[PDB]
């Protein structure tokens, strides 16, 4: 059951359950105190349920104090599938789980059960809450991203207060130049012309009208209902007249009160834009880098609390009228109708071959669908910016534009079970009647998706086992291995549009570089990146800005592929990802960690996944491409059936037979 | 020599880890002949025996750690003082 | 292909008798192959539901047949169509083979008519599989109804047309899991089949002819027909189902009441006055709350438990044999040896618990005493039997007791005694005795709830009525659903059920929206306009205008674009009503919700997944013999399995000691766990080994074959691992 | 989270070494009585239903307080293992 | 400095509107909600607590000659509303014994010393020819909602405890209406509105409600550590 | 239920901040007491605040003053933060005078003293005067309650005066959290704990007590009945 009042620290679990788990412990504590002479009397007191006295409970909670229990949920895909919490005695018969760790265990509250184990030893207890406590495992070991980040409602709350309005500048209320616009545009505002927040180019009439000295004043004003949280007013926070909203300066103090350092807190937030899972993700990650572990913990619960609390009062539901069909739909479908009618006669005259007609109908609706998709979010963004659907979608709360397009616009082209998409698409959306046929048409691909999800449940840790069998050896046993070897991580990739150069995407470089050890010192931009420091995230971004100006194209970073210490890896060669952000502690069972963090996402690989098998098992491909045994020069032939290429040097040559279908790469 | 995941896995130095696959008689026998030793290198090996994990806490780098209060610390200083005879 | 009757409710068994499996006992299809076997094919149109298949492994394999589909003289599924003569539709129907279907042009059921004519020149029709647009002349057949496309359950979802196929099978499969509720209720917005389901499933009891009612017990009904018959229909009083639910009948007629042929006399288990009553009509407000309806959690008004709506009876069945043994015969008796007088207060003179007594886990249900094991020792004891007053042997306690988990109050007993009067008692079985125990099981935090549209959810919080959203008049809502469950799951049908349910709540009426011949938006709107002149037309007259809070919300409302400004609050609130939404005030501050919120009546039901079967907690207890890991028993549960992946978890942390505990002191290593618990009662810390059980056993068990396995020191040296 | 964990992770070369130190300190802080402590004059961990953590609720938490001050020494091979145990029992009673 | 006019409007025992006017900006909420929240919970009253039927030994029974099972009779018994006319009675055991062809109303209980059944036409059960219903229900006084499973009240060994909905307050609504009065526009006409079963009048409940609140403010009496 | 008399513990630190915990309360009274008290603390608590200002030669709120570093807006913003206390309930309003010249940091003490007025805020930074800078000003302090914007009250002293937003309420912020606490067999009891911030005029405790006293006195208003009934 969701436990929103629990600290990330904590979990709730029923009374009768806690009493039985710690029963041998409890017997002792009733023997500590005057509750029982000895255990043989302590046993008899606890048999039947109606007897447990008030003082007995006091002893139970007293036994619990500080101790943690382990919680588990069914498919234990990565290590964060087991986390430790303190138990909290709760009414009821369910375990209560903190919402921020419904991320780690793939858990939603629709019947899922969980396991609960007691650790017995002071040892077992220590490692449970030095290493396994949830409020310490904030960043995933797979990617350095944070994993205990704001979920469904937390995001939807914090975005609904950290947002701004716009309104009817029916007349071009220019204040930038006129001082007659100071009072007399407010004249018109305190008349029936201009709204409190509109473009006046430098200010909105709200900016001028209300100007608060405290933030304490600003919300005291909001409390008295003269301005809302997402109106724009002038406030003076930290020696600057800020034109902003009370909601977004409220958000600021929320972060600023969680972590005691108002000054850092200001500096690592971006209150010039609304808050969405990405910005909050970065905020959580920035906070853990700069401020420590436990402060980020207090930050997360705090975000969870105002996120929840503002979510309910803000009042956002889903009525049927909140899925607004743009006027653009009937227009685009009329075009689409006509242009499909053009295709019909062009084929009926003999100008379009029976194939070229088909390709051209699909081309039509694929364009028609994408056009009305952007035509929906155009409506939302220009006319109803606070529409719940649109808010949930563009916040991290809930919604894929792929999904929204099916409620408001239309479900597009369905597929046959074979793979050929149908000619007639689904013209309807869900907000209006989906026809009988359009629904039976849709179900063909509906089950092919349900089936593909079923055929990945079948063997859950299948990938993970085989990687565990290969890697369980691997530990961190040495501080370093003396090896002066390394790997050069390339920052560009040659042949894509041509045989040229191109910056690898941001995530990729980032994934290959975040938290490694330099192999060599690298002086780039008045920066000597000394050999053998753990290059951080900012570090990695600098090398991207560096190779963006073309100053380098590779990096020397020490790697496991070039580690030397035998039966595991050394600290330096491995990267810089414990669950924390700090360097690898000796004894980190990186082996299983690497397996899980590769195997867990394997549950999201469609059937892709067989490719992944095909790489991990050295195996022959399907459409295998010949490599050149010799570094030489290309020459091709035009033989009627079957061409070929010679790769030739000044010394010797080699011909490679090429089937007729085989399209080449090198000119 | 490049080998796939399962092949690389199914061919280990240790026989304890090897006995966890599908033909155990072959590897038990092959090792029983040559009097093979099984260094408790990896995890899987060391879990078949009921013996402690060679990682985390069970890393020999950390296993042997000592802690002393400053009151009993100077109380060992006096374990070497009575070592002078007469 | 034989399996227990899935009879959780009437609909549950009807769905079950009408399943279709691919995994034949002769070896037709096996668990390995799936890809094209499971897909829906064009021929399933009208013949096999594209929805009914269950989640997980058995997708596409087990799928129920369509509503109108039936099997002809040979094993072929055959859907109906009706012929159209040129452009004139007939009242004459032809069930057609799947192959025979493909010979013709079949038009779609949503095709306009004028008595018998097609109307639109531009017609929707299917040839063999393809979607074809056609003219009225070409049309050769037409469908009978959109219901013939899906199964019986899928055909109880009212606005399926607005529901994603994926979460639609979740609605279909859950109605199976609907548990019969004592205060059961038909949906506020139906589809039409809900009186036909309780007919064809024989849940209920209907008059055989026209006549009058002569007697009505809670036990039996008696009626006087025209033909002169006077028939006695005895009721099924409190019968247990195969999976625990209570299936009883309730008489719904009075003595002296005339009846018509086919009229209803008694409701089945989940039948409200002739309608399928799988759940109840709650007043739902769909809005977030203080992290209490997170992902798919649910929040509940305590008014439900007071009104006892979400209560459902359940009856368990406990059974013991008085078997006959080498030691001597066992005896169902009351004088058990080592029992306190307090532990026997509820057992009758024979040892059976008395009817109507609350039994708690550990009490006696039927007392049984068996002779002391290890045998009848003839050499010496046989003399003692003649020496000492014969039958003065020793007898122990082997009674039957309410297991961990619980029971209720005893409601019925069954003795099948020797002198066997029509019973097949097994060899050595002397008698058998059964006791039925029952429980009124109210809704509790942890139980599972769902609508017809596929909205899974566990009750996460039971708020008191005081502090939860209410309307201007002091009426609170009953259920709080999180709107974040709507957009991912494309199932807007539940949203329409809410709006239409909102109008039906102030109009005092229920609705039937046929599956694809449903309620259109204008119809719904004008019923809501009809509603608001009652929700608020009256509040003007009672002397109350708009609330200062209502206008504060209409302020932000027009800023949000939900009312058109310049109108009066009344005309705006009606604009705002028609959109399903209303001004709602947080019950704990009295301050209005700052935007309008849609509320209404939604049909929600209680699933078979309650929390009595579900919670377990094990400290210590029994342990198996060949494997020493533990198991449940007298007053102890079993452990949870700590699997291989859960070992990879602890390995991925540094939980070396925690993991070894899981494998040593928890259940497997005898010396270890004994030292572990004795040292807990001490107040000590638990020591790990010693040596581990698995390690010593694997030595000697290898040692059983002629393998010399030694253990060695750091330098190669012998280490004795057997503790002297 | 837990009070000053960031400071404790910094105390040790190995994340896991903190754990063993905490655990082994907790063990002695239970075994040779509870008066083994280095910090018990004024403000040391407390509880509710009275204020009563000054004798014996959570030994591992204690160890984390104690290690949070420079009073304790941790390291690979500090003192011979065997006179370690002989000198602890010999110095403190409660047995 | 205002002195708000407290007008009262009564409609029998059931409904009562209590108007307080004119109030300071936004006190309609400040006074009319914490009283709402108190009226709903902490107002005391009466409710049926346990039942015993002739020959019936558990709640899951059927009574010959009676249409309704023992469960439906209990569900019908929760609606029984009973005024105690003397604030010294903690419990009254009502007796009902009827036979023959009859629709047994709550009327048909035998009269008690100082007890008023506010619910005379409440339908208890439908008895046919020769149907015998003989029973003893007990009403206690209490506060709030208390299930049968918490209290477990039984007079006799065959009794069946019934859930207890004591609070005699059906619904409660307050209306904050704008009242110009004199100088100011933004004044609140707090008029709050109360429905009740007759055991206690709406006024009776409101007065106990403000008195529960008053008494809760006195808990900030003396500070401590 | 009586002998569970709730313990009212108080942490107090000076005169700005104070946490007040009240426990254990019957299910759902934490909100029933904490929100009606916060709504009282924020509005109906009485006090003083600057309501109108007049500057030497300044004719609009937006101008810039030669020889003065601060814009006319930040001076009025500094004046909104001025906290003052009347010591005799016969002062209905005080017009404070400030006249200073030359290079100086004019503090809130640089207002000239007045007979029954205590500036709680003597070190407040009012303005920074540059070389040849002349500052001559009269600000108007009135008694009031709550927060009142400039265009609502429209206070006038001189024809050049500029009305200022009024922060009367000597309460800066108020927040309460209602926590579950356990007494024996029940977990679901309410632990009402509320924070109060104030400007120094009154301590947090004095504000809370004035607040409960307003509420108490408002309950006494259901004591003078009348007669009517509605139907149509
Ligand atoms: Zn290395």
From Swiss-Prot, chain A:
> What is one GO biological process annotated to this record?
DNA-templated transcription
Q: Tell me one GO molecular function of this protein.
A: DNA-directed RNA polymerase activity
Give me the residues that bind Mg(2+), please: 108, 110, 112
Cite the binding residues for Zn(2+) 2. Answer: 481, 563, 570, 573
Look up keyword Transferase and say if it applies: yes
Which UniProt key words apply to this protein?
Answer: DNA-directed RNA polymerase, Magnesium, Metal-binding, Nucleotidyltransferase, Transcription, Transferase, Zinc
Q: Which GO terms describe its cellular component?
A: DNA-directed RNA polymerase complex
Subunit organization: The RNAP catalytic core consists of 2 alpha, 1 beta, 1 beta' and 1 omega subunit. When a sigma factor is associated with the core the holoenzyme is formed, which can initiate transcription.
What this chain does, per the entry, is described as:
DNA-dependent RNA polymerase catalyzes the transcription of DNA into RNA using the four ribonucleoside triphosphates as substrates.
Q: Which family does it belong to?
A: Belongs to the RNA polymerase beta' chain family.
Q: What is this protein called?
A: DNA-directed RNA polymerase subunit beta'
Species name: Thermus thermophilus (strain ATCC 27634 / DSM 579 / HB8)
Which portion of the entire protein is included?
Answer: 632 to 1314 of 1524
UniProtKB/Swiss-Prot annotation, chain B:
* Disulfide topology: none
Quaternary structure, from the entry: The RNAP catalytic core consists of 2 alpha, 1 beta, 1 beta' and 1 omega subunit. When a sigma factor is associated with the core the holoenzyme is formed, which can initiate transcription.
Family, per entry? Belongs to the RNA polymerase beta' chain family.
Q: What does this protein do?
A: DNA-dependent RNA polymerase catalyzes the transcription of DNA into RNA using the four ribonucleoside triphosphates as substrates.
Entry protein name: DNA-directed RNA polymerase subunit beta'
Annotated source species: Thermus thermophilus (strain ATCC 27634 / DSM 579 / HB8)
Curated annotation (Swiss-Prot), chain E:
Q: Which GO terms describe its cellular component?
A: cytoplasm; DNA-directed RNA polymerase complex
Q: What UniProt keywords apply to this chain's record, in alphabetical order?
A: DNA-directed RNA polymerase, Nucleotidyltransferase, Transcription, Transferase
Enzyme Commission numbers on file: 2.7.7.6
Stretches the record annotates as Alpha N-terminal domain (alpha-NTD): 1-224
Taken from the UniProt record, the cysteine pairs bridged by disulfide bonds within this chain are none
- At the top of the EC hierarchy, this enzyme's class is transferase
Q: Which reaction does it catalyse?
A: RNA(n) + a ribonucleoside 5'-triphosphate = RNA(n+1) + diphosphate
Give an example GO biological process.
Answer: DNA-templated transcription
Function of the protein: DNA-dependent RNA polymerase catalyzes the transcription of DNA into RNA using the four ribonucleoside triphosphates as substrates.
| Notes on the domains | The N-terminal domain is essential for RNAP assembly and basal transcription, whereas the C-terminal domain is involved in interaction with transcriptional regulators and with upstream promoter elements.
Q: How does it assemble?
A: Homodimer. The RNAP catalytic core consists of 2 alpha, 1 beta, 1 beta' and 1 omega subunit. When a sigma factor is associated with the core the holoenzyme is formed, which can initiate transcription.
Give the similarity note: Belongs to the RNA polymerase alpha chain family.
Report what the protein is called: DNA-directed RNA polymerase subunit alpha
Give the species this sequence originates from: Thermus thermophilus (strain ATCC 27634 / DSM 579 / HB8)
Swiss-Prot record, chain F:
| Full-sequence portion shown in this chain | 4 to 235 of 315
Keywords of the record, alphabetical order, are:
DNA-directed RNA polymerase, Nucleotidyltransferase, Transcription, Transferase
Question: What top-level class of enzyme does the UniProt entry assign?
Answer: transferase
**Which gene name belongs to this protein?**
rpoA
Q: Name one GO biological process term.
A: DNA-templated transcription
The protein's name is: DNA-directed RNA polymerase subunit alpha
Q: In terms of domain of life, where is this protein from? A: Bacteria
Give the reaction(s) catalysed: RNA(n) + a ribonucleoside 5'-triphosphate = RNA(n+1) + diphosphate
Q: Is the keyword Transcription assigned to this protein?
A: yes
Region Alpha N-terminal domain (alpha-NTD): list its residue ranges.
1-226
What's in the domain note? The N-terminal domain is essential for RNAP assembly and basal transcription, whereas the C-terminal domain is involved in interaction with transcriptional regulators and with upstream promoter elements.
As recorded in UniProt, its EC number(s) are 2.7.7.6
| Role, per record | DNA-dependent RNA polymerase catalyzes the transcription of DNA into RNA using the four ribonucleoside triphosphates as substrates.
Give a Gene Ontology cellular component term annotated to this protein: DNA-directed RNA polymerase complex
* Oligomer and partners: Homodimer. The RNAP catalytic core consists of 2 alpha, 1 beta, 1 beta' and 1 omega subunit. When a sigma factor is associated with the core the holoenzyme is formed, which can initiate transcription.
Q: Which family does it belong to?
A: Belongs to the RNA polymerase alpha chain family.
Recorded GO MF terms? DNA binding; DNA-directed RNA polymerase activity; protein dimerization activity
């Amino acid at each position: 059951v969701v436990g929103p009042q629990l600290k990330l620290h904590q979990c709730g679990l029923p009374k009768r359950m806690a009493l039985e788990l710690f029963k041998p412990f409890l017997l002792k504590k009733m023997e500590e105190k005057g509750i029982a002479p000895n255990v043989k009397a302590a046993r008899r007191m606890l048999e039947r349920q109606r007897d447990i006295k008030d003082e007995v409970w006091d002893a139970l909670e007293e036994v619990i104090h500080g101790k943690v229990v382990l919680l588990n949920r069914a498919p234990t895909l990565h290590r964060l599938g087991i986390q430790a919490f303190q138990p909290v005695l709760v009414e009821g018969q369910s375990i209560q789980l903190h919402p921020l760790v419904c991320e780690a265990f793939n858990a939603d509250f629709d019947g899922d059960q969980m396991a609960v184990h007691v650790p017995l030893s002071s040892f077992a207890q220590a490692e449970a809450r030095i290493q396994m406590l949830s409020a310490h495992n904030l960043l995933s070991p797979a990617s350095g991203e944070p994993l205990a980040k704001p979920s469904r409602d937390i995001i939807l709350g914090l975005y609904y207060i950290t947002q701004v309005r716009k309104e009817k500048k029916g007349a071009g209320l220019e204040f930038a130049t006129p001082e007659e616009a100071l009072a007399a545009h407010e004249r018109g505002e305190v008349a029936l012309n201009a709204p409190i927040k509109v473009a006046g180019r430098e200010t909105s009439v709200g900016r001028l009208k209300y100007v608060f000295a405290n933030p304490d004043e600003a919300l005291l004003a909001v409390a008295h209902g003269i301005v809302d949280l997402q109106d724009v007013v002038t406030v003076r926070y930290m020696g600057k007249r800020l034109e902003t909203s009370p909601g977004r300066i409220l958000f600021a103090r929320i972060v600023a009160e969680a972590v005691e350092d108002e000054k850092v807190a200001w500096e690592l937030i971006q209150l010039d834009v609304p808050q969405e899972k990405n910005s909050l993700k970065d905020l959580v990650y920035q906070a853990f880098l700069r401020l420590g572990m436990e402060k980020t913990a207090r930050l997360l619960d705090a975000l969870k609390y105002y996120g929840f609390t503002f979510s309910t009062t803000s009042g956002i539901t889903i009525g049927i009228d909140d899925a607004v069909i743009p006027e653009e739909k009937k227009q685009y479908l009329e075009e689409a109708d006509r242009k499909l009618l053009q295709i019909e006669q062009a084929y009926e005259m003999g100008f379009l071959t029976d194939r070229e007609r088909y390709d051209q109908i699909l081309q039509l609706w694929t364009e028609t669908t994408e056009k009305v998709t952007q035509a929906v979010f155009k409506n939302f963004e220009e006319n109803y910016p606070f529409n719940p659907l649109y808010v949930m979608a563009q916040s991290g709360a809930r919604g894929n534009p792929q999904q929204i397009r099916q409620l408001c616009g239309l479900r597009g082209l369905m597929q046959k079970p074979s793979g050929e998409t149908f000619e007639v698409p689904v013209r309807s959306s869900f907000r209006e009647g989906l026809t009988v046929l359009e629904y039976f048409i849709s179900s063909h691909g509906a089950r092919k998706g349900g089936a593909d999800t079923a055929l990945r449940t079948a063997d859950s840790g299948y990938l993970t086992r085989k990687l565990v069998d290969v890697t369980h050896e691997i530990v961190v046993r040495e501080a370093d291995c003396g090896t002066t070897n390394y790997i050069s991580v390339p920052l560009f990739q040659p042949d894509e549009v041509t045989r040229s150069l191109r910056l690898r995407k941001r995530a990729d470089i980032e994934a290959g570089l975040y938290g490694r050890v330099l192999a060599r010192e690298v002086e780039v931009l008045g920066v000597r990146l000394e050999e053998g420091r753990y290059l951080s995230m900012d570090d990695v971004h600098l090398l991207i800005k560096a190779a963006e100006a073309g100053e380098i194209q590779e990096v020397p970073v020490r790697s496991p592929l070039t580690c030397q210490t035998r039966y595991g890896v050394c600290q330096k060669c491995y990267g810089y990802d414990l669950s924390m952000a700090r360097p690898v502690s000796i004894g980190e069972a990186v082996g299983i960690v690497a397996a899980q963090s590769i195997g867990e996402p394997g549950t999201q690989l469609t059937m892709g996944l067989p490719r992944v098998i095909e790489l991990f098992e050295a195996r022959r491909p399907k459409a295998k491409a010949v490599i050149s045994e010799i570094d030489g020069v290309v020459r091709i032939e035009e033989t009627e059936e079957k061409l070929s290429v010679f790769v030739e040097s000044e010394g010797f040559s080699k011909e490679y037979k090429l089937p007729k279908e085989a399209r080449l790469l090198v000119k | 020599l490049l080998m796939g995941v399962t092949k690389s896995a199914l061919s280990t130095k240790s026989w304890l880890s090897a006995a966890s696959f599908q033909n155990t008689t072959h590897v038990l026998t092959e090792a029983a002949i040559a009097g093979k030793k099984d260094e408790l290198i990896g995890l899987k090996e060391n879990v078949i025996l009921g013996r402690l994990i060679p990682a985390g806490t069970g890393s020999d780098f950390v296993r042997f750690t000592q802690v002393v209060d400053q009151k009993t610390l100077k109380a060992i200083e006096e374990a070497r003082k009575e070592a002078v005879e007469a | 292909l034989s399996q227990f009757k899935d009879e959780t409710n009437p609909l549950s068994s009807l769905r079950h008798k009408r399943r279709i499996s691919a995994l034949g006992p002769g070896g037709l299809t096996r668990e390995r192959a799936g890809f094209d076997v499971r897909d829906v094919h064009r021929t399933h149109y009208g013949r096999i539901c594209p929805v009914e298949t269950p989640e997980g492994a058995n997708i596409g394999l087990i799928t129920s047949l369509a509503a109108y589909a039936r099997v002809d003289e040979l094993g072929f599924i055959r859907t109906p169509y009706r012929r159209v003569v040129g452009g004139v539709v007939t009242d004459e129907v032809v069930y057609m083979t799947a192959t025979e279907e493909d010979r013709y042009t079949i038009a779609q059921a949503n095709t306009p008519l004028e008595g018998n004519r097609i109307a639109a020149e531009r017609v929707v029709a299917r040839r063999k599989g393809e979607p074809v647009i056609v003219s009225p002349e070409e049309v050769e057949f037409m469908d009978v109804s959109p219901k013939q496309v899906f199964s019986v359950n899928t055909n109880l979802i009212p606005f399926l047309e607005h529901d994603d196929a994926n979460r639609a099978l979740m609605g279909s499969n859950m109605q199976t899991q609907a548990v019969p509720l004592i205060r059961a209720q038909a949906p506020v917005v139906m589809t039409g089949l809900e009186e036909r389901v309780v007919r064809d499933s024989l849940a209920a009891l209907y008059a055989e002819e026209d006549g009058e009612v002569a007697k009505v017990d809670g036990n039996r009904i008696v009626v006087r027909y025209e033909d002169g018959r006077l028939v006695e229909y005895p009721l099924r009083r409190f019968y247990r189902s195969n999976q625990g639910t209570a299936l009883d009948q309730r008489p719904r007629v009075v003595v002296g009441q005339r009846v018509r042929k086919g009229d209803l006399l008694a409701d089945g288990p989940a039948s409200e006055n002739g309608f399928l009553a799988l759940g109840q009509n709650v007043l739902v407000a769909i809005m977030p709350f203080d992290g209490y309806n997170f992902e798919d959690a649910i929040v509940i008004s305590e008014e439900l438990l007071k009104r006892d709506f979400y209560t459902s009876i359940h009856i368990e069945r406990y059974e013991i044999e008085a078997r006959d043994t080498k030691l001597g015969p066992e005896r169902i008796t009351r004088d058990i040896p080592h029992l306190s007088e307090a532990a026997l207060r509820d057992l009758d003179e024979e040892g059976v618990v008395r009817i109507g007594a609350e039994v708690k886990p550990g009490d006696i249900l039927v007392g049984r005493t068996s002779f002391k094991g290890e045998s009848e020792p003839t050499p010496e004891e046989r003399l003692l039997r003649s020496i000492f007053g014969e039958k003065a042997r020793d007898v122990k306690d082997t009674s039957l007791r309410v297991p961990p988990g619980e029971g209720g109050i005893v409601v019925r007993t069954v003795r099948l005694r020797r002198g066997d009067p029509g019973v097949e008692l097994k060899p050595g079985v002397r008698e058998v005795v059964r006791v039925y125990v029952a429980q009124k099981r109210k809704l509790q935090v942890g139980d599972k709830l769902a609508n017809r549209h596929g909205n899974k959810g566990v009750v996460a919080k039971i708020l008191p009525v005081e502090d939860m959203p209410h309307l201007p008049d002091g009426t609170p809502v009953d259920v709080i659903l999180n709107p974040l469950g709507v957009p991912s799951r494309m199932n807007l049908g539940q949203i329409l059920e809410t709006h239409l349910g909102l109008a039906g709540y102030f109009l005092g009426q229920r609705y039937i929206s046929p599956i694809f011949d449903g309620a259109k938006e204008p119809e719904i709107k004008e019923l809501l306009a009809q509603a608001f002149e009652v929700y608020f037309g009256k509040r003007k007259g009672e002397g109350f205008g708009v609330d200062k809070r209502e206008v504060e919300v209409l302020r932000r409302a027009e800023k949000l674009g939900l009312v058109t400004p310049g109108k009066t609050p009344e005309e705006q609130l009606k604009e705002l009503f028609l959109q399903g939404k209303v001004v709602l005030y947080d019950g704990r501050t009295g301050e209005p919700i700052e935007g309008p919120i849609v509320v209404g009546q939604m049909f929600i039901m209680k699933l078979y997944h309650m929390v009595e079967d579900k919670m377990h907690a094990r400290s210590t207890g029994p342990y198996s013999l060949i494997t020493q890991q533990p198991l449940g028993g007298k007053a102890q549960f079993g452990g949870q399995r700590f699997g291989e992946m859960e070992v990879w978890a602890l390995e991925a942390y540094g939980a070396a000691h925690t993991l070894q505990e899981m494998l040593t002191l928890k259940s497997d290593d005898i010396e270890g766990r004994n030292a572990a618990y004795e040292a807990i009662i001490k107040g000590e810390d638990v020591p790990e080994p010693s040596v581990p059980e698995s390690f010593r056993v694997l030595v000697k068990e290898l040692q059983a074959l002629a393998l010399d396995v030694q253990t060695l020191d750091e330098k190669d040296n012998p280490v004795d691992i057997f503790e002297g | 989270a837990e009070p000053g964990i960031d400071k404790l992770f910094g105390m040790v070369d190995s994340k896991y070494r903190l754990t063993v130190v905490v655990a082994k300190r907790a063990q002695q802080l239970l075994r040779h009585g509870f008066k083994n402590t280095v910090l018990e004059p004024e403000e040391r961990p407390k509880m509710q239903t009275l204020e009563g953590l000054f004798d014996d609720p959570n030994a591992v938490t204690w160890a984390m307080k104690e290690l949070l001050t420079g009073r304790l020494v941790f390291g690979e091979n500090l003192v011979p293992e065997d006179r370690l145990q002989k000198e602890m029992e010999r110095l403190y009673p409660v047995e | 400095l205002k002195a708000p006019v407290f007008t009262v409007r009564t409609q029998g025992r059931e409904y009562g509107e209590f108007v307080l006017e004119p109030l300071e900006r936004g006190f309609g909420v400040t006074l009319g909600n914490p009283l709402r929240r108190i009226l709903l919970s902490s107002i005391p009253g009466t409710a049926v607590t346990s039942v015993y039927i002739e020959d019936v030994l558990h709640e899951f029974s059927t009574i010959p000659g009676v249409k309704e099972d023992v469960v439906e009779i209990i569900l019908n018994l929760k609606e029984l509303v009973v005024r105690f006319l003397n604030p010294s009675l903690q419990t009254v055991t009502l007796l009902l014994k009827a036979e023959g062809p009859k629709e047994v109303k709550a009327r048909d209980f035998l009269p008690v010393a100082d007890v008023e059944i506010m619910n005379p036409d409440l339908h208890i059960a439908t008895l046919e020819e020769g149907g015998r219903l003989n029973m003893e229900v007990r009403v206690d006084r209490g506060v709030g909602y208390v299930p049968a499973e918490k209290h477990g009240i039984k007079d006799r060994i065959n009794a069946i405890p019934v859930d207890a909905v004591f609070s005699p307050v059906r619904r409660v609504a307050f209306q904050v209406e704008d009242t110009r009065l004199g100088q100011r526009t933004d004044l609140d006409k707090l008029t709050l509105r109360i429905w009740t079963d007759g055991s206690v009048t709406p006024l009776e409940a409101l007065n106990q409600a403000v008195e529960i609140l008053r008494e809760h403010l006195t808990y900030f009496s003396n500070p401590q550590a």
